[PDB]
Amino acid sequence: ASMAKIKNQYYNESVSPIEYAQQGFKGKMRSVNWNVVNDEKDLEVWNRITQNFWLPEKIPVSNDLTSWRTLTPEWQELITRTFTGLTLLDTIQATVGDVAQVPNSLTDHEQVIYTNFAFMVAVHARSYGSIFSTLCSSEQIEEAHEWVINTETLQERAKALIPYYVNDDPLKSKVAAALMPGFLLYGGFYLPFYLSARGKLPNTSDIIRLILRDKVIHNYYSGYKYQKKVAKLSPEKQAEMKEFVFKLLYELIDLEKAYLKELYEDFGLADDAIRFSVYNAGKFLQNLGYDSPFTEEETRIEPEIFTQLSWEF
Template sequence: MSRKAINWNELTKDSVAMRFWNQNVQQLWFPEDYNPANDKATWDLMDSNQKDVYKKALIKLTHLDTEQFGQGMPLLVLHTKNQHIASVFSYMQMMEAVHAKSYSNIFQSLITDSQEERDLYAWQESNQNLQGIAEIVVGMYHKLFDPKPSKKDLYLAMVASVFLESFLFYSGFFYPLYLAGNGKMINSAEIIWAIIRDESIHGVLVGLEAQNVYEELTYKEKQEVDVEVYELLNELYTHEAEFTKEVYEQVSLVDEVMEFVRYNANKALSNLGRPVFFENVKVNPIILNGIDTETKNHDFFSAKGNGYIRSTNLVSIGDSDFARLEALLGRSVV
């Protein structure tokens, strides 16, 4: 069998791969574009519980992005037959490394004591919920070390990836969004907003690709994964609930964070073309504004000027883009 070089010129500009390539490129950013050190004065006024929650939220995010650039995306790239989609996944992998580094930039700005930083990393390595979440997700990725994995394993690895992108990150994002909605830690929040913009398109694209793989499963395999997806959701949700209680109780936000966790679990399922699982989810409007990626370039939190966005042509994917994508594909994507 001959091996084919990628040819982007065979795509129309409306193709899914071209749209997601262009969107990713328009969103390009680097941690060095931002200056979280401007938050140091606010940080110094926060009490020890608030600082503890913030650091633990961000170390969780660092850990998930580390697994995503190091394990998840490279293995998905290897087994994605569509070369253009694989190419977009490669770009996304690079951005996961950017995300992971950006948290170190925030820590460097806020944590002046190197022992404090070592303690935080030691906590991450010994925390049963963080380790448990990573073991589950990475375990599903590692099925793809097989040169010819089953379609079912490929589908479930993509489901794990969508859960990471669209669900597991959000108990980490909650606190920076909550503080920013209250006018605190705005410079660091600009990094968080940039990451959320990226993760939202990552979850949609991997979800679309997962739906394509699902269509190739046999009837029996479909029945099996229809159960396994919810078993996976349940396992991860249990860890999320424990992590949230452990970290957020000290600032009395456990219930609010769990609403947000359920909201994003539903979002992840939607990205996989599945119905919502959690009913009557009510998320704090401040947080919903924080994840609305369309508002961030309109000075919603009066942060404009403090930060700097590299791209002069930044167009976030928003509901209207999803509607166009849905029209193109003839099915729901969110």
């Protein structure tokens, strides 16, 4: 009964494969249509993440061996532990968190963008392994894995977020997904930024920057999709979601402070890494469309560290 001829009527008469599977094997399934992109932001993001493909073997980490050998065994242990803990977060994102966003998608193109995210964060975990292969001894590697499984403050950050990935609530799942690359990343990234400012491990620093380039987009994209769904909710449901975001973030900030104090206690870096972490919590809120409540002193970052965001050593 329409007086205009709407193009692509087949789309409204069909379902994506995941929708077919979720709704009890009902409906006619449509192929993705890369010639009709429902949200142009999806095409922009697909193009940037695929143009940004890299693998760790492209960076000659072996050229860091002399720099690595200037670090005491205590510093080498700290780096192996910190990076292995980040590898755990990468593993959760690749195998649970990002793949859980596929069925939560607003568009067919978003469904496969999250498969790229999952694969690329697996590459991030691969690259930590690659760094260790070149620089670390077998004993250093194994001891870091045993420390990861046995450090309760580390385990608790992951345990707090994983339950949301059931997609019992898709928006809560998306917030918990974005908190990995948008927040928990940074307490650990403080360490390579600190080492880079001191002229250590330049080639490893190149891998850290490639990882950062991907993670920034992952956080941005989830926040973009969070805001798009939330704006369509009732004012009441939007208030409930905003209180959820602040509550979960504050909970994760407390868990992260406890973890970073343990990780960096012997080195004095915990207070600086916590302010750096809380600064990025403020940006995480902005990424979801909210205002940062954090103070300047809460979030103060030295310039040699702050620029990389884009006698006593």
